[PDB]
Amino acid sequence: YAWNRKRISNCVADYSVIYNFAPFFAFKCYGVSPTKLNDLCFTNVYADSF
């Protein structure tokens, strides 16, 4: 009910180091593919943890 929201901007994002941080099975994505996140790039990334 009080989920955090962290803004991520002005940095280089390496999405392959996420797998070494938490023990999860699938990097479930909807609009993109989890293996193509290192080539294309965005404006802002928002992280919501609950």
Added chain:
Amino acid sequence: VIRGNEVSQIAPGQTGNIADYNYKLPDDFTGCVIAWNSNKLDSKPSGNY
């Protein structure tokens, strides 16, 4: 033997570490993939190397 993160990379048309440098499946691959947990056999409390 791989880890649980990289089971999704054993698939045709995949990009990662195992798919690019260890084990690559073709784009027109036909066949089956069978993966199962082996925590009780391939792991030790001191660390299997």
Added chain:
Amino acid sequence: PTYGVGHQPYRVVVLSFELLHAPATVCGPKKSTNLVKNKCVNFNFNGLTG
């Protein structure tokens, strides 16, 4: 063994099949039938049905 379920070891066996270009060598348990000619029949030649 104290690691998470996403970092536990996993045994992977990949079975790759060669589709029919040569005479078949690996065929499963189906009994054969005597060949009949000059009659409208259903046929099953090495998995090719017709």
